[PDB]
Ligand SMILES: Nc1nc2c(ncn2[C@@H]2O[C@H](COP(=O)(O)OP(=O)(O)OP(=O)(O)O)[C@@H](O)[C@H]2O)c(=O)[nH]1
Ligand SMILES: Cc1cc2nc3c(=O)[nH]c(=O)nc-3n(C[C@H](O)[C@H](O)[C@H](O)COP(=O)(O)O)c2cc1C
C-alpha cells in the first residue's frame with residue numbers, strides 16, 4: 017500500500033463517528049475539482065457540492081447507503097465553489113476496522129460534463145471502485161492523533177500554525193474539527209490525521225466520539241495557566257485513559273512564548289501565580305505516564321514540528 021498523497025484521484029475520507037460525518041481527508045485533485053481549500057472542506061459535511069439541479073432522489077440513495085453502512089454508486093449533478101456545474105460519477109464505501117466495525121467512509125468522484133450510460137457508465141464504475149480499494153489499503157496507514165485539553169490552551173492555533181504556517185486572529189471555541197499533514201519521518205512519507213476537540217466541560221458527552229481507534233493523544237495545557245495544568249491530572253488524563261487504556265499520551269505545554277513574556281509574568285504575578293516550568297511539566301508527564309513531554313509555541317512555531325514528529329514516532333517506532 018502507498019500513502020494517501022500519492023493517490024492522484026478525486027476522493028475524500030469521512031469519520032461517521034463524529035456529528036454529521038465530517039471530512040477528515042481530501043485529496044488535492046478533489047480540492048482542484050471543487051475549487052475549495054483544504055481548510056474549507058475538512059471538518060465539514062460534503063453536502064455543499066449539491067445545488068439547484070441536483071436530483072434529490074439520488075442524494076437520498078447516498079444518505080440511505082451511509083445509514084445502512086453499505087457501498088453505493090450513483091451519478092448526480094454537483095457544483096464547484098464558483099457555481100460551475102459538473103456531473104459526478106460517485107462511489108461510496110465503508111472502511112471497516114478489525115472488529116468489522118465501520119471506521120470511515122471513502123468517497124470517490126469521477127467528474128464529467130454528462131450523465132454517462134451503458135458501456136461508458138460500466139467502465140466508469142469499475143474505475144472508481146478500483147480507486148476506492150487503493151484508498152482503503154492506503155488509509156489503513158493513516159495515523160490518528162487526537163488533541164485534548166482545556167478551552168483556550170491553544171489546541172486549534174497549534175493545528176493551524178503547523179498546517180498553514182499562519183496564526184489565527186480571533187479566538188473561536190471548537191466543537192470538532194480536523195486537520196491533515198504529510199510528514200517525512202526517517203525519509204518516508206506519513207499521513208497524519210489530527211482530531212481537534214472542545215475544551216469546554218459542556219462537551220464532555222460529545223468529545224469521546226473522537227476516541228475509538230486513536231493512535232496517539234496530545235494532552236495540552238498552557239504554560240501560563242496553572243489551572244489548565246492541574247486539569248491535566250484531574251480531568252484529561254483520567255478521561256483519556258478511561259476510554260483508551262493503552263493509547264500513548266504526549267503531554268504538550270503550549271504558549272511557550274508567553275512564559276518569558278513581561279506582561280504575562282506580571283499578570284500571573286497579580287494572580288499570585290507563576291508560569292509552569294519545564295521540570296514541572298516533565299514531572300506531570302512522568303506522573304501520568306506520558307511517553308514524551310514537549311513544549312512549543314504556535315505563534316513562533318518553536319518546538320512545533322517536533323510535537324507532530326514525536327506524535328508519529330510514538331506510534332511507529
Ligand atoms: N502568545 C500565544 N498565544 C496563543 C498561542 N496559542 C494560542 N494562543 C491564544 O490563545 C487563544 C486560544 O487559542 P485556541 O487555539 O483557539 O484554544 P483552544 O484550545 O483550541 O480552545 P477550545 O477550542 O475552546 O478548546 C487564541 O485565541 C490565541 O489568542 C501561542 O502559541 N502563543
Ligand atoms: C465519503 C463521502 C463522500 C461524499 N461525496 C459527495 C460528493 O461527491 N457529492 C455529493 O453531492 N455528496 C457527497 N457526499 C454525500 C453527502 O455528504 C450527504 O451524505 C448526502 O447529501 C446525504 O446527506 P444529507 O441528506 O443529510 O444532506 C459524500 C458523503 C461521504 C460519506
Ligand SMILES: [Cl-]
Pocket residue numbers: 168169238240241271
Ligand atoms: Cl493561557
Ligand SMILES: [Cl-]
Pocket residue numbers: 272273313316318
Ligand atoms: Cl518561543
Ligand SMILES: [Mg+2]
Pocket residue numbers: 171172173188189190212213
Ligand atoms: Mg479549539
